[PDB]
Amino acid sequence: PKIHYRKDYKPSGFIINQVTLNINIHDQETIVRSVLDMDISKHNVGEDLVFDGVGLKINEISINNKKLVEGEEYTYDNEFLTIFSKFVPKSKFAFSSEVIIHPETNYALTGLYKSKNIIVSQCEATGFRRITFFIDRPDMMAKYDVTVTADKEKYPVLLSNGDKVNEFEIPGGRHGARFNDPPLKPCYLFAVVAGDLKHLSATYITKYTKKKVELYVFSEEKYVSKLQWALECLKKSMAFDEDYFGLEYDLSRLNLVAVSDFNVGAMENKGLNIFNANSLLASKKNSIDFSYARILTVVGHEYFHQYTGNRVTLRDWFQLTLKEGLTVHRENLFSEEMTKTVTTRLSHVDLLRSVQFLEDSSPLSHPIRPESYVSMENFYTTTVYDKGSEVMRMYLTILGEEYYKKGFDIYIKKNDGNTATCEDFNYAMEQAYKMKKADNSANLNQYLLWFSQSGTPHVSFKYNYDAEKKQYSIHVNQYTKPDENQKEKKPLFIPISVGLINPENGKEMISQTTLELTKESDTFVFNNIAVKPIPSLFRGFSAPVYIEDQLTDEERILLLKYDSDAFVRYNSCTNIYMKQILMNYNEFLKAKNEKLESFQLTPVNAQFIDAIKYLLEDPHADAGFKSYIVSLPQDRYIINFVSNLDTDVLADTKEYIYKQIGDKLNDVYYKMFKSLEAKADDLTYFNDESHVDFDQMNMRTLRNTLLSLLSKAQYPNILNEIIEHSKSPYPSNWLTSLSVSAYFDKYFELYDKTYKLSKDDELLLQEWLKTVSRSDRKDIYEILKKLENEVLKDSKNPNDIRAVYLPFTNNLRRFHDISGKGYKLIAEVITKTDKFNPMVATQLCEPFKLWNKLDTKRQELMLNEMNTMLQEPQISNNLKEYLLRLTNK
């Protein structure tokens, strides 16, 4: 296995200036002709000319129109085409080839493949080499002239990058289109689509240049009525980049295309963004509420790449976070502005501190700019994306909006049209930092450690107040645990956004303040502090760290009720829950270990329950925030705080805490569930796909959360509400009715009813599969076998496989059954999927990421299955390298 090292970057000895492609799609094969106009670079030392090319069938290859002969002048080993240097010209030359590829059977969904009846490409990161020979790396920038031909009846719509400059008929019922894309681009941004596509379209006029941009959104004909929201989101994205960043689209046309079979969410191919249908298509009758925020974020994400990734691209793949972390940050700014709900930011934090913190304390931990890789297909991690986004967001926190915008423009202007590195972005931010500090000696050299140092910092606090001097001090310490990437961890530049709350009246005691912690520890002192405050720390979650606030639960309750910052309120609640969880967990664990006949559990803090009631009953409070405060922290967040976690004991702990709170608040929950109904389920705009109300959807989230709590509690006659909920027009509601009915004998009646409602829309059926998969059923294993035999079968569609199995893996009691049978089941699915889609097979390994954090019996059971998978003779490169890293082999 070849290991690529970041320190080994060197420019190529060759240049590719022009790519001229002819892609002729036929029934059983696709023939690709390519002429590369090439040159010798200043770095050339007379080496062999080596092209990437994976799985290509060579018809012929030539240099300057002279056919080369296999063996004497080149070798091809199905991975690399080597032309011996004695046959490589010394000046500008043309390399041409004709190869045969087979999209129909390309079930890995990389390169050129068929998704249902659509031919589609996916070239990031190194998939272009599966289409034709290339020096397949992002610093090889070239012009593209692309002709696609195909049967006209099956493939009437042909698309690639650039301007469509010719359309022509071909004998035998065929036709072609030629696309010329003069601006230089890396090959991972190449795309082609052919299909019987239907579309919606609009014209957008840019803010400053007043350019007319044609916007097209495509899907198969069956789902064309689900395209409206995506088009609205694209218009919103363009406006936001214009309004916040001053950036306009510079091309004549932008196409978005939905396909059913896609390894991830979407891809930013220049002018031809290609989407998983589940991240582009929705309608109010056939989609759950989550789809609306999903499409907004994914359309925005791919649009924002046009500057951060496409116009400014990557020198090499180790810079991935430069485009992905920065684009997620841009996406997050956009979504926060569009939704105007505090739960948007809270949802990103919630994901980071569960999924990404788990990754960063696992054997897979890496910095956002890794030092090495074997598989690019495994490189697209929550660390690179979501911790990368938080590192990009900290620049905005440190600089403030005005100077952040100044630094961002410096980055765009300096690097527009070229490749770039993480250092280029830090340099632009540093120029703004010097301006903000009015100090040309200021620098951000320390900030670069956020790119190189792995692991999550821990930040802890101690406080002192002198009542006579009116002087308050915050002593802060930071610590990152050593790991495999750094034996000694250096202190980071950690920005700590803080407020000081007067406990007597809940008011702010200081102006907006961002402490700049740059040492292992520092003490921050404030004068003229008239009373002892409660500190509001890391407002907005201002750094990606473990916060140890060292506050009492009384102080945390005061913040939860009265602080101004949504995150600190949510975090104060989180911390109260965690203290309770760890305490009850240890009490249950000791009772288990000591085989106690009787024991005591510490009850939930009664003032905390009172505060939850206070917030729930406040008609001025936010429904989305309310849904967070009645939910315990995610299991994957909890596990970062417990060694040798016994998942059964944790399940018992959660059950006790939920029952303690429900025994006090269920009547409040039921009253709110009923009173929220009119606004939550308002149908006034049900048939307007342009009208999306994020507050209303949060109201439904709250109702569906409360219904789940009441159903688990067997609240009297709650089954009446469940059955009525099943009649709601909103899929979020009627799919919730299925999941909460798990606790009642009507489950399979609602199983059948919701199946019939879901079965005729491909994406809705996948949402139904997820709902069944996450159902809290004692017979869940039998239910999964029924889904396999009756619905999933041998589908190779990743959306189908992920829907059936991933939600179930979050079933704490059943997936972690002490027999190991859930580990065995998912391992069988992984090995089966690995035969045709190694990238998705590795995604299905996600439940094993926490293996060494569980109790020793479950560690052994998980490790056994991973070793079984590693011993499969046909294991893919992706899955092997992933499992080797995960098992510390």
Ligand X SMILES: O=C(CC1CC1)N[C@@H](C(=O)NO)c1ccc(-c2cc(F)c(F)c(F)c2)cc1
Where along the sequence are the contacts to Zn ion (CB under 5 A)?
A: 324, 327
Give, to the nearest 10 degrees, the angle between helix 606-616 and helix 647-675: 40
CB nearer to Zn ion: give 324 or 350.
324
Interaction of residue 878 with ligand X, rule CB under 6 A: no
State which amino acid sits at residue 704. Answer: N
Instruction: Residue 888: name its binding partner from Mg ion, Zn ion, ligand X, none (Cβ under 5 to 8 Å by kind).
Output: Mg ion
Binding pattern to Mg ion, positions 48-87, x when CB under 5 A? Answer: -------x--------------------------------
Instruction: Residue 239: name its binding partner from Mg ion, ligand X, Zn ion, none (Cβ under 5 to 8 Å by kind).
Output: Mg ion
Number of residues that bind ligand X (CB under 6 A): 20
Q: Do residues 403 and 395 lie in contact, with contact meaning Cβ atoms separated by under 8 Å?
A: no
Is 199 one of the annotated binding-site residues? no
Interaction of residue 263 with ligand X, rule CB under 6 A: yes
**Core vs surface per residue 777-803: b (16+ CB within 10 A) or e:** beebbebbeebeeebbeeeebbbbbbb
Between residue 782 and residue 841, which ones bind ligand X under the rule CB under 6 A?
839
CB nearer to ligand X: give 259 or 672.
259
The alpha carbon of residue 857 and the mean position of all alpha carbons in its chain are separated, in whole angstroms, by 32
Binding pattern to Mg ion, positions 212-241, x when CB under 5 A? Answer: ---------------------------x--
Q: Report, in Å, the least distance between residue 254 CB and Zn ion.
A: 16
Backbone torsion region of residue 173, taken as left when φ is above 0, otherwise alpha when ψ lies between -120 and 50, otherwise beta: left
Binding pattern to ligand X, positions 87-126, x when CB under 6 A? Answer: -----------------------x-----------x-xx-
Per CB under 6 A, the list member of 184, 200, 264, 601 interacting with ligand X is 264
> Which structure tokens are listed for 706?
């409360």
Is 268 one of the annotated binding-site residues? yes
Q: Which residue is nearest to Mg ion (CB)?
A: 55
Between residue 554 and residue 593, which ones bind Mg ion under the rule CB under 5 A?
none
H or E stretch covering 298: helix 290-304
Q: How many Cβ atoms from other residues are within 10 Å of residue 314's Cβ?
A: 23
Between residue 126 and residue 185, which ones bind ligand X under the rule CB under 6 A?
127
Interaction of residue 220 with ligand X, rule CB under 6 A: no
Q: What are phi and psi of 661, to 5 degrees?
A: -70, -45
Is 301 one of the annotated binding-site residues? yes
Distance CA 889, CA 887 (A): 5
Is 820 one of the annotated binding-site residues? no
For residue 278, the cross-strand partners are none
Instruction: Residue 376: name its binding partner from ligand X, Zn ion, Mg ion, none (Cβ under 5 to 8 Å by kind).
Output: ligand X
Q: Is 363 exposed, middle or buried (0-12, 13-18, 19+ CB in 10 A)?
A: middle
Instruction: Please choose, out of 35-43, 136-144, 317-325, 355-363, the segment that lies near Mg ion by the rule CB under 5 A.
Output: 355-363
Per CB under 5 A, the list member of 255, 297, 343, 647 interacting with Mg ion is 297
Query: Which residue is listed with tokens 């006949």?
Result: 597
Distance CA 419, CA 17 (A): 15
Q: Active site residue: 98, 302, 377, 587, which one?
A: 302
CB nearer to Mg ion: give 598 or 789.
789
Is 606 one of the annotated binding-site residues? no
In this structure, what DSSP letter does residue 98 have?
Answer: E
Q: Report, in Å, the least distance between residue 312 CB and ligand X.
A: 14
Q: Report, in Å, the least distance between residue 125 CB and Zn ion.
A: 12
Per CB under 6 A, the list member of 55, 89, 265, 363 interacting with ligand X is 265
Distances, alpha carbon 721 to alpha carbons 326, 702, 746, in Å: 45, 15, 13
Distance CA 88, CA 576 (A): 69
Residues 6+ apart with CB under 8 A from 758: 764, 765, 767, 768
Catalytic residue check, 302:
yes
Q: Number of C-alpha atoms within 13 angstroms, CB side, residue 130?
A: 20
For residue 219, the cross-strand partners are 198
CB nearer to ligand X: give 55 or 265.
265
Residues 6+ apart with CB under 8 A from 610: none
> Which structure tokens are listed for 682?
């308002």
Q: Report, in Å, the least distance between residue 251 CB and Zn ion.
A: 18
Is 305 one of the annotated binding-site residues? yes
3-state secondary structure 365-390: CCCCCCCEECCHHHCCCHHHHHHHHH
* Closest to 217 (Cα-Cα) out of 277, 145, 167, 297: 277
CB nearer to Zn ion: give 304 or 472.
304
Is 790 one of the annotated binding-site residues? no
CB nearer to ligand X: give 293 or 459.
293
| Residues forming the site for ligand X (CB under 6 A) | 110, 122, 124-125, 127, 263-268, 301-302, 305, 324, 376-377, 380, 385, 839
Binding site residue list for Zn(2+):
301, 305, 324
Residues belonging to the binding site are 124, 265-266, 268, 301, 305, 324
Residues tagged active-site: 302
